[PDB]
Design a binder for these strands. Sequence first.
RNA 1: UGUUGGAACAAUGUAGGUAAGGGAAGUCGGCAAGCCGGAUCCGUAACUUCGGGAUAAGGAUUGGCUCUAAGGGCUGGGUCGGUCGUCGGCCGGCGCCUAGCAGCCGACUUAGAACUGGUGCGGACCAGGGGAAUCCGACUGUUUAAUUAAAACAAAGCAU
RNA 2: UACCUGGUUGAUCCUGCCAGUAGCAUAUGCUUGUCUCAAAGAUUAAGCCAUGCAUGUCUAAGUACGCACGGCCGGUACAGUGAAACUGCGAAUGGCUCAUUAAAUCAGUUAUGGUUCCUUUGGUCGCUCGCUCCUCUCCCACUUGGAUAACUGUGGUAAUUCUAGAGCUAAUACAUGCCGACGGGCGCUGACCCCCUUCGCGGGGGGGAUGCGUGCAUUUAUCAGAUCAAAACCAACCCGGUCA
RNA 3: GUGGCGGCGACGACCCAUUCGAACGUCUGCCCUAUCAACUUUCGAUGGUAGUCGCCGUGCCUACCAUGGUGACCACGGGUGACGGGGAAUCAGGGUUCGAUUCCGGAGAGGGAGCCUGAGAAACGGCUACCACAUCCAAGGAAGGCAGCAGGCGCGCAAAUU
RNA 4: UUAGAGUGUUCAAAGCAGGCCCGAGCCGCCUGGAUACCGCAGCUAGGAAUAAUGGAAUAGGACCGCGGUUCUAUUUUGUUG
RNA 5: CGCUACUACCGAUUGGAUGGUUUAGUGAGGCCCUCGGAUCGGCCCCGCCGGGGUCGGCCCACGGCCCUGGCGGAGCGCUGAGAAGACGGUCGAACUUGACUAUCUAGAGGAAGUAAAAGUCGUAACAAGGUUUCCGUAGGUGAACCUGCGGAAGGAUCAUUA
Lengths: 206, 262, 153
Amino acid sequence: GISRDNWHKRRKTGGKRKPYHKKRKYELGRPAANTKIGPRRIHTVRVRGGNKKYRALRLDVGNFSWGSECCTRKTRIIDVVYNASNNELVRTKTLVKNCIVLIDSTPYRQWYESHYALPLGRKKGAKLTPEEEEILNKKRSKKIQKKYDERKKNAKISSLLEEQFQQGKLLACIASRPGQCGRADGYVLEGKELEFYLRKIKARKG
Amino acid sequence: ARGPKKHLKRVAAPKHWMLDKLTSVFAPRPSTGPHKLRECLPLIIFLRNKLKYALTGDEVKKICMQRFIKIDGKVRADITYPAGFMDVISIDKTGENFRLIYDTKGRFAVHRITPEEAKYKLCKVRKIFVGTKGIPHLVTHDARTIRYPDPLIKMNDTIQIDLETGKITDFIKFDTGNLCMVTGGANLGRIGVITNRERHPGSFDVVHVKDANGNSFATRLSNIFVIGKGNKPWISLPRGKGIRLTIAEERDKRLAAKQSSG
Amino acid sequence: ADIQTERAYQKQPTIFQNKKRVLLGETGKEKLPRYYKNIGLGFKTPKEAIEGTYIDKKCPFTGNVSIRGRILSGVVTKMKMQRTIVIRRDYLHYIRKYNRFEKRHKNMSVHLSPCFRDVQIGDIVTVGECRPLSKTVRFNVLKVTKAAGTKKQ
RNA sequence: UGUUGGAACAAUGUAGGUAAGGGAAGUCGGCAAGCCGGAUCCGUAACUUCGGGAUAAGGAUUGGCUCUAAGGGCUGGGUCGGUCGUCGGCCGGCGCCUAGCAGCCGACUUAGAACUGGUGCGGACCAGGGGAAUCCGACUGUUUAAUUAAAACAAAGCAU
RNA sequence: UACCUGGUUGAUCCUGCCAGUAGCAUAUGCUUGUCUCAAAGAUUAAGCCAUGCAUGUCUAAGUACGCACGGCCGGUACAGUGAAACUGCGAAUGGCUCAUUAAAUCAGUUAUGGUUCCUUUGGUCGCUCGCUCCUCUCCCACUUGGAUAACUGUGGUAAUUCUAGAGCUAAUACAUGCCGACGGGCGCUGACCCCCUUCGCGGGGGGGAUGCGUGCAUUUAUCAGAUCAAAACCAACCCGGUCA
RNA sequence: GUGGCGGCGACGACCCAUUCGAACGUCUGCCCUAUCAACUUUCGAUGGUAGUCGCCGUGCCUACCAUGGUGACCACGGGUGACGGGGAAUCAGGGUUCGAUUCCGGAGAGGGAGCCUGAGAAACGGCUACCACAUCCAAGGAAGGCAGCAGGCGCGCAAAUU
RNA sequence: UUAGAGUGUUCAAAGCAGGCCCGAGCCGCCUGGAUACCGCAGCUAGGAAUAAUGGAAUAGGACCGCGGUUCUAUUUUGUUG
RNA sequence: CGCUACUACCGAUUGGAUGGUUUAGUGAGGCCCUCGGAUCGGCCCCGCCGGGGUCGGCCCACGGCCCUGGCGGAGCGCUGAGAAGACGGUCGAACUUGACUAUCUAGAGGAAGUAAAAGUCGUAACAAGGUUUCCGUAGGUGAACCUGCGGAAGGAUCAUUA
């Protein structure tokens, strides 16, 4: 019933616009597809001119990216922490564009431990001995052992991101519109904008 | 009001179709082919009035369906197939071939041409359109998306296509020293060398033209269509050679031939 | 406060602030490199919009708005609500019956480049067309045009 | 428990309550009791001495439990070397709490949101029935202690 | 065809209107013999509706056992007409009237670098590439599933373009899905192996078994996208021709 | 007893195009009224950041801030016995009046609202309710929209043959 | 639609029609359906009288002069780095 | 001012009739969502045959392993399709009552204006209209009007000799 009209509100000149037609099909709205965290449930919508839309109601995995290493992976969301539009959209655990979530760090850590072969998690020394020692060392007559040494240096992750990997969660904005496309895809947070976003979470409570 | 339109009334239809007022109410509505309404010529009106081979729609209905009409090499089967600039059409049963270019007033004059000129045609481009896989693409007046052209093809040019496989041969670039014929607008159907193109960033780029008769005019870049190199047109032109004559001058020609052929 | 005002994080999308990977000689250098696209039609991109630190979403030279179609002028009158100004625009309408003109005026809102303090009121400006920036914000400001008939150098 | 107790539970009382349907039909008369009753948010007429009328009339909300946002105080400014007992008085040298940030405390408040209840929610108590007119007196005030609280006296104003 | 007359006064001049004069659109009276064109339920009631028509669709090129005709033709299927009926397209075009509507609609002018578009016309449509079962078909691709319709057969209510229950049947309807495209190709990991040369560590220079991903759109992120005028350093020794 | 064979009908994908248009915009243009001089609002009234919805651009909608837009060059509110325009009557030069009317654009099917199918309806010779007027009835229920062509009713100064 | 050109609808109102040449022998010819007008607003380009409006007054135009900081590369032995 | 007709007005009824816009309450219906599970098909735990391979079997009666057409009992046990219906949201016609506004109307009694024919009382104005006329303001009188204060001449003097 809702319409995205421009003829139901006053002019700039304070006057009132008497309409000259009843509500029209080619300008229409539908209730919000306010998608939460849960089992993957994406339900269909048909729109004008075909090109049927896919709208999401409950999502858990998304194609979040790590911008400082040109790598991206599928990753299981586990939280929602901060939305600049509403406050009542962080209690509800909703999901919308530019909604700061906590993604699972498992694929990225695993990838890091396989790319540069430098450990990124150690609290109990539980695991992670066999693979890392092997790969850095010789395996095809001294060729590879050179190129991993090039990567031993310049392996960068800030303590702003180092502590998150130790903790298993990565702050990550969403940059894909879950309501209309359905995919909860975005980027991980790092650098200064991580720093700015970190303080807001620290002292949001007021 | 609720969707497409499917009834074109009388002389509300384009004026160059050369129609009446007391043939009822409606006019044939072209089938949305390779040209706009306001540039095309329905194939039906080319068989009742311009040619006067037939009498009614029916006698036209049975001709086009008997598969004698040939447009652009492959036969058509709709009564109202839009025609357009530089389109070749052939009649194999009687043996003629028409060219259908604009007159000096704009009427799509009947123009019989030789089978040699019935092979190719001249088509302007609209955008060089390099697409997926690094593949260069073109578009022409009649919506021929030609892949893989000569890279020198840039804009406003004229191509020559064999009318069996497209495959442009013998292109001519847009330059400021070449013949060009104006299509569309009040200046419809004059011929002359360009001699100028005064640019206007953000609006219609006005192109002046000087004629071989010494006269001059100007149009916008869209209405320009190049039909040859130098002062040589690739195509023969009808009587008058597309050179506009004032109504005073056209009056003289009418009076002289009077009582001299009938 | 006194520097920026925001709830979300504002940045130029095209630029990627987090290219910072090398420690080597300097961890940080000439940082968050600038993005700017010049409009055509000869309008000179102000030096403020090149070396500036501000971030804007609809700035003609440092945003995504696409100026086209209509270019007009005006006389600025108000320096009210942030990031847009209100310009009177005087012109004459001709009455057919009499052989005489009749003055009118129509004043409209236009966005601004937030580069700018030092845009006084009552001064001419050249304004260009744009996509419908807001309910009543269509035209956008391209370059201001009056400082000589004013105070000290 | 106001100068006494015990047993029962009749009428008439005295003092409290409720009652199906109609709602002043009762009566000299709406006498008596009965509705409205606090607060927040909207809305407010005829008249007028322009101050009032006005809480005019007329609406909506009110519980719990879980949150959200906003409204404040006190303290602050450097490695370095020697002297003096990188911490400090001193020196010299630096910092320049430089955009105003950082840490510790502190009272009750106001606005919004989610959920829940047999839709109950100023839950006892405290707490206005309204509207349209007429007569009289301007008003606030006073009086017939022990039947008359008024339209009676006073009253500022006016005038002899 | 840039036009004026009667009227205040005993008479005159003028301001001024009243009345005249012609066209025009509707009504109306009287009258009307021919022909050629031609308006016609707008004004008030965007008030009311009996009655009948105003939206159907077939080509060699989606379905064919009505038995409704007709094949001669019963044989290892389907003459051919063919009404029904499933499917696709059509009803969103035409016609009516002006109740709304005062920068609203609409006219002239422009951008849609800010979107969608059945159909007509042009383009591509060797998409990826990697399993073959138990002791005997992994799997159909030289064809993979069941379902309703008309049709037959029982009915229901007073009634309608109302439908239920039972038995078969097809696809260009709803679904399922395959060597072939036989990737030699390509990029990342990449057992290694080989030489020059460093005792050696080392560096250069080589070719590579294994395994993963494969421009067909959607979604997100990152990269480069020009270099317009020039000569030397330390320093990799590299593309090269001159004697050395 | 096998492998290759052209012409076509139908078909779906879209950086795609081309056409058919459709939709929100840009600048200027409207009749009478001051016995309409101040209008607009947290409930979007002008704007900013972020975002759901939309086919997209935008207060379109929600949150959080900012306090703003128009108006004597006539806003605002009212009236029209006003659909707009191409045009029409009248005329020396200016003009005054009229435009429902067959072309272009808009709105509608008794008043409103909602929605399925479809690329394109908020379609009504499509459905869903409500309201008023209503047609069959076994009293249990069913169906409709002549501001389409003819017709009749009522209306009238006034308008055709089922 | 207004104007207007060409044309004998018997004239005209109209309409965009029609005229030859012969039994027909060509296996037909010649042509028509134009032009002006269409403010105001927008685009374009010559004219610069009249009318707005501008410029160095507490310094501003001119001289490719000789100096600093700060950076963006083209390409020379280093093909690339 | 016993003198009628018409036009409009104020007016107690704190009046009536119609629209039109709205606050508030109730809110049928479609749509989105969270549930839902009448019913309809496939799977697997079972038995038996025939089809082919198979141990015991020379092949077979029948059995063990696999696959298949068919036969039946049972877990309805795991899975796809799914209507009726509901909590909630959204849009929201309509009804009931308030406010606002508009045009039209009945109303005792009062007071205007116009036309009436040959009415009664007067004579105010036009001649120095017999008090010179008129303007402003104020009081009074049956009525035109009279008077007081200041003006104008549209006055009956364009002027009156130191």
